[PDB]
């Protein structure tokens with residue numbers, strides 16, 4: 001049944017053809033249970049083992065290495081019996097890495113808390129219904145409830161389904177709907193219809209929602225919807241956002257593999273075209289059946305050369321290091337690839353209650369009468385400090401401490417607040433903090449009484465647990481509450497009838513203490529207290545009282561105001577019909593006005609500053625709350641989102657106002673407006689979606705289950721440490737200390753981490769460019785293998801792996817947080833940097849091939865044809881007497897390759913220092929800036945010589961020690977790489993853009 005809230009009780013009963021006195025018959029239940037299903041939220045799954053594994057091998061790059069490793073495995077078996085003992089090294093090293101980087105990928109995904117599981121914790125196991133079977137209520141399984149049955153809820157129950165209220169048995173029904181609105185203030189329900197078909201949850205005061213709980217009262221209703229069709233069901237469906245979207249950096253890495261997989265094949269085509277005269281001459285060695293082993297050889301070397309095999313490892317290591325750094329700042333990260341994204345954040349959406357605020361009602365202002373003289377009426381106003389339920393804070397007057405006890409009026413004020421109260425304070429020794437017991441707006445009064453300590457009761461020695469209600473207990477020892485005239489909607493006030501508990505206060509006699517909506521209470525007052533005296537209520541006194549109350553309730557204050565009063569001469573206990581609330585207004589007449597208290601859910605201390613720091617970094621902050629527009633806007637001004645007098649006509653909307661706008665306007669409002677109130681959970685995700693529609697990196701901060709959808713939809717969901725489990729499980733980060741400042745620190749961390757990643761990524765990929773150039777030269781020029789896949793993997797995994805990791809340790813800039821968010825589509829390298837790295841690559845591709853060709857010609861260890869006939873080295877065994885005159889196994893010597901590898905390694909160790917800064921010379925920024933980089937290079941060279949000396953290695957790597965003359969050659973062709981890059985920088989740092 002849709003729109004049950006807009007229908008009358010009769011119509012809802014008629015809709016299901018059920019009687020409120022009997023309920024559904026077993027046949028109806030069976031029927032409805034077949035049509036509507038069971039009243040439960042469906043669990044989730046899909047993490048199929050034979051699926052999450054296939055995903056690890058879904059990347060275009062990992063597939064190329066998968067194929068390559070296989071092709072390399074076939075060439076290992078179909079290998080000569082020369083030394084096929086260590087030929088499968090390469091095929092296994094690759095397969096090892098793949099299954100390694102793949103098994104880890106399943107680890108981060110298998111280990112994931114389900115937000116749905118946490119949400120289902122709000123679904124009660126049992127429910128109470130009235131069926132045709134019995135006349136007495138039946139306590140059955142909540143999941144067995146169905147649309148149409150008559151349900152009963154009472155204090156403490158967790159609402160079992162979305163229900164249309166039929167009849168309230170208590171004076172009022174109090175409901176805590178915080179899971180849908182984020183507010184803990186209990187809402188007063190009624191049974192009248194709510195006309196508006198587009199009404200929001202907070203407007204549906206005649207409905208009870210599944211997952212919510214009853215704070216007080218008892219009522220009967222009819223189930224309208226169950227399962228996924230409920231409000232918490234909408235939250236659940238939204239949480240089912242399985243479609244995983246990749247971050248900007250991840251997107252940049254995917255396009256890289258795209259073009260890479262193209263260039264690879266493109267080069268493979270070039271090679272198959274450069275060798276035109278291959279099968280043109282009578283060749284018998286190159287079998288058409290078995291001869292393509294030449295291409296399946298280079299095809300492998302090419303892939304291994306282009307793919308930065310070690311990149312995915314250095315990224316995770318860098319992110320892991322960053323994650324620990326943030327945890328140090330009380331920022332627990334649940335998603336590693338989030339650290340980077342947070343730094344790209346341009347818009348931070350934020351919940352208010354419990355996130356921006358403490359979610360702890362606090363009385364911050366109060367007043368009593370000061371003087372009365374005809375038309376003149378002055379007041380004694382005080383402010384109160386503290387933003388929590390803890391009895392910590394002072395009462396000030398003119399920003400100066402005072403003793404509440406000194407003012408008689410305050411003594412009565414406190415007495416009313418202590419007695420006309422149904423809540424209390426409790427110290428949670430486990431969590432080490434004071435918590436409320438009962439309603440928030442009532443506990444604020446309790447807490448208030450503890451701060452005022454009107455009787456100057458000694459509380460220093462007392463402990464936490466004892467301090468919690470020390471002053472309130474003092475007043476209860478003086479005046480006893482005999483009974484309560486519970487609050488009722490028709491009167492909007494409540495009172496307690498009390499009498500002295502000691503003959504020492506006999507003069508007070510019977511008194512009724514009243515509190516409530518100001519207007520009604522004040523109208524029922526005929527007197528006003530002035531100290532311990534009392535004078536009549538006059539027009540001037542009344543207007544003075546109301547005028548101040550009006551200011552407190554709608555300006556920079558916008559406080560929730562309560563008027564406090566006491567009937568000095570109440571009726572006889574026997575003249576009061578206590579079971580008929582409709583009589584209570586009359587008993588609360590002829591009152592004496594005592595004072596007013598003003599309270600609010602206060603912003604956290606570090607929020608205002610945090611907002612400003614965000615703004616400096618070009619980061620906008622938008623409030624999205626389930627609370628009302630008025631207080632939402634007031635808080636925006638308090639924390640700086642809006643200026644003190646800024647016009648907010650079109651910069652603030654309620655959920656209903658927002659939906660009223662056309663889809664087009666809705667989209668733009670999200671860019672201009674900074675405040676959305678009276679919102680439903682779907683509104684928050686909707687606005688986040690709109691922001692993202694403009695390709696903005698948006699974050700969401702929240703604490704309630706009503707923030708879940710939005711926390712999920714956002715690129716970075718940030719949850720409060722003291723928030724709900726649902727919010728935490730749906731977020732990428734958790735602020736363990738609920739300190740908003742941590743968000744700014746996390747953003748900075750994210751920008752600093754990215755700048756370094758942007759470096760070692762360029763360093764690594766730059767290296768792969770040279771490696772591919774080499775393979776291309778030593779293939780087109782028909783020269784002998786200068787480098788083999790086994791050699792390349794070691795370079796891209798260890799040799800450069802360490803230096804890359806060390807680059808992630810570069811010191812961050814100073815103006816990092818003083819600059820605007822970087823565009824998400826910003827390319828890691830293009831323009832001048834493209835050409836700049838286009839050259840460095842060409843160089844490396846020549847320094848390696850040349851270092852190999854050098855040994856085969858001008859070296860003093862194996863001279864060759866100084867006429868480049870080294871190209872036809874292949875035709876040495878076929879026609880030896882041609883132009884040889886030496887062993888043919890010379891074109892496989894370890895000397896030439898070792899020469900090339902030492903050039904590559906040395907060039908990279910030097911190109912690492914070139915990576916310490918983009919456009920800054922190593923002189924303007926010395927290498928010793930990053931002690932880790934230096935220590936990194938040393939660990940690399942040592943591991944390099946390790947492969948040239950430890951006998952069991954040179955064999956598998958096909959390498960061989962070098963002379964002091966050999967090495968000199970390397971340092972002569974590598975070292976100049978620093979000069980080249982140092983020059984390219986100048987070309988831009990002093991011309992292009994510098």
Ligand SMILES: C/C=C(/C)C(=O)O[C@H]1C(C)=C2[C@H]([C@@H]1OC(=O)CCCCCCC)[C@@](C)(OC(C)=O)C[C@H](OC(=O)CCC)[C@@]1(O)[C@H]2OC(=O)[C@@]1(C)O
Nearest residue numbers: 255256259260263306768769772773776828829834837838
């Ligand atoms: C790994 C090694 C190589 C040689 C490779 O093919 O990388 C190219 C490539 C795919 C791109 C290029 C490389 O292009 C060339 O070097 C041109 C062809 C020369 C080959 C001649 C044969 C000897 C990157 C690497 O390098 C240079 C030096 O220009 C820069 C950049 O990459 C990035 O922004 C990095 C993203 C992680 C990309 O143009 C990128 O394509 C894109 O879509 C981008 C936007 O990504």
Ligand SMILES: Nc1ncnc2c1ncn2[C@@H]1O[C@H](COP(=O)(O)OP(=O)(O)O)[C@@H](O)[C@H]1O
Nearest residue numbers: 187188487489492493494515516517518561562
């Ligand atoms: N326990 C209480 N005792 C005295 N007054 C109360 C109590 N609870 C609420 N009130 C008052 O009655 C008002 C509640 O009106 P109501 O129609 O239920 O909802 P709303 O807050 O949306 O106006 C409050 O603004 C408050 O001043």
Ligand SMILES: [Mg+2]
Nearest residue numbers: 188205489492
């Ligand atoms: Mg109301």
Ligand SMILES: [Mg+2]
Nearest residue numbers: 182353354704
């Ligand atoms: Mg909240």
Ligand code: NA
Nearest residue numbers: 711712714717
């Ligand atoms: Na998210």
